[PDB]
Design a protein around this nucleic acid. Structure first.
Ligand SMILES: [K+]
Ligand SMILES: [K+]
Ligand SMILES: [Mg+2]
Ligand SMILES: [Mg+2]
Length: 135
RNA sequence: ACAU
DNA sequence: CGATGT
């Protein structure tokens, strides 16, 4: 603790894993939805969590905001730190879209800078992250 | 085991 | 119960 309330919180929602993947970002304090990604027909939970963080980085940079990002995903936080999404999802025609988005997110990380702190939301202490889908 |  | 990840 404590929660940094001046922050952006992201989370993934899916129908199956692998399955339909979406994500959203919210104001941690107010719950206002700041962005939502159109559902992607096939992806994994961790790919979605990764895309959500990267989108948050791009969203905050475009707005000249120094707020941190919260995610509850140990995996996605590490993938962003590494600039490399180490997903096991097969590459085929069905997964082409999510893989294109992941490749492009990595490419963005490798061509841009940011100071945005990427923080672990401590679900065991604080309850569900504010961007949670409730599924 | 931990995080989803 | 299954799956994605470190
Ligand atoms: K949920
Ligand atoms: K496991
Ligand atoms: Mg999550
Ligand atoms: Mg959730």
């Amino acid at each position: 603790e404590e929660i940094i309330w001046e922050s952006l919180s992201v989370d993934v929602g899916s129908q199956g894993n692998p399955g339909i993947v979406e994500y959203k970002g919210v104001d941690t304090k107010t719950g206002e939805v700041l962005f939502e990604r159109e559902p992607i027909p096939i992806g994994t939970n961790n790919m979605g969590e990764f895309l959500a963080i990267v989108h948050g980085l791009r969203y905050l940079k475009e707005r000249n905001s120094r707020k941190p990002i919260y995610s509850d995903s140990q995996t996605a936080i590490k993938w962003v730190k590494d600039k490399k999404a180490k997903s096991t999802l097969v590459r085929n025609e069905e997964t082409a879209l999510i893989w294109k988005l992941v490749d492009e997110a990595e490419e963005w990380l490798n061509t841009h800078t940011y100071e945005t702190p990427i923080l672990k939301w401590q679900t065991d202490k604080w309850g569900e992250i504010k961007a949670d889908y409730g599924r």
